[PDB]
């Protein structure tokens, strides 16, 4: 049986300077059943409950103060500003290399035309030495 | 359309001296039988559930052996500790930030009450939305 | 709609071995996909230690896919943590389209640091959507 559930799982472009850019045209990544990726945002095709998730991986070669943030935001139709749905702050430095993963997840009622963004404050600290470390997705329940 | 019991409640940024959960806010929900009664999530049916919660603490400098705790408890129709974490933000102004994330899968029974509590609500950070939450997902 | 929730065997210490109790099979420490379709794959592992050593400790947790039509191993989700008593949990989860016969594995690099006391914190599963 073929599912018609709006789903997305986009991955970060490891070659995008000073930014966390989401791609669907990669192995084990997808945009299906109405979900679109427009201006680095996931656009919701229909109203309903959705599971929203994102993971980023930060890495630094040592400690030089550094604040790392990762946020999933929602912009509703006819609105312009992002309202935080999920957000986390980490302080990796309280020269050995440090690693800081941030995982955000939750269930949210979304409306048709909503735009979701998964953003960070310090893309200079993003790590891409391996696949599956930086991602963002939604699944209609 | 799924009939899986789900919940995602957020802290009241105005409720001083407490970590009070709200479902009647934008981007917060109680669906498929889950209820929020007496600051607790009430389980509608038996089964495996993913339980999660994040709280963010922030202080304006370390003058002091401050202990920060975050716990998720279960009360059955028997009180058990499900998830717990302790953090010591003070090694020794210079602001500090301390997030505590708790997550896990637990077998819950119908009528179970889940609570997500902290010991220092005076250190809770509310300068931004989406930082303090409590949720459950039936599997 | 098949589901699978498997937990770490606390008696097979020194290796992250999975224990089962829907129709998703557990063969050779891997979850085997029964049919073509979409799936949420999640997991959690818990690490702990009594202190820090000279050699820099790196903790990793990865969920891989061995596609049946090509037989190679590709990361689906991965995370690294540098804990330097300490406790370090690692979470993963995402929706992937998978084919019949695909094998999923959830592995770590330091089983000597695994925490077997927490069953509700060392697990691996899938749910067909
Ligand atoms: C509704 C639906 C699709 O059927 C479903 N959603 C989620 C799960 C599930 C069960 C156990 C899990 N343990 C973990 N997860 C699980 N997901 C991940 C990662 N990590 C560990 C978390 O602590 C976590 C926190 C918040 C959401 C989150 O899910 C993420 F996909 F959005 C996670 C099962 N079923």
UniProtKB/Swiss-Prot annotation, chain A:
It comes from the Eukaryota. Changing residue 30 to F: Biologically inactive. Signal peptide: none annotated. The lineage of its organism: Eukaryota, Metazoa, Chordata, Craniata, Vertebrata. Changing residue 78 to F: Biologically inactive. Disulfide bonds join 63-93. Residues 6-141 form the THD domain. This is Tumor necrosis factor, soluble form. Changing residue 26 to W: Biologically inactive. It is found in: Secreted. It comes from Homo sapiens (Human). Residues 1-141 are extracellular.
């Amino acid at each position: 049986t073929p599912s018609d559930k709006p789903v997305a799982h986009v991955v970060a472009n490891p070659q995008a300077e000073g930014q966390l850019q989401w791609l669907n045209r990669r192995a084990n990544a997808l945009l299906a059943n109405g979900v679109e990726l427009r201006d680095n945002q996931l656009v919701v095709p229909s109203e309903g409950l959705y599971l929203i998730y994102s993971q980023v991986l930060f890495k630094g070669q040592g400690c030089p103060h550094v604040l790392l943030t990762h946020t999933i935001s929602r912009i509703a139709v006819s609105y312009q500003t992002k309202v935080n749905l999920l957000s986390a702050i980490k302080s990796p430095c309280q020269a050995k290399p440090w690693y800081e993963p941030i995982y955000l997840g939750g269930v949210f009622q979304l409306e048709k035309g909503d735009r979701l963004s998964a953003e960070i404050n310090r893309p200079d600290y993003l790590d891409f030495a391996e696949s599956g470390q930086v991602y963002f997705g939604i699944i209609a329940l």
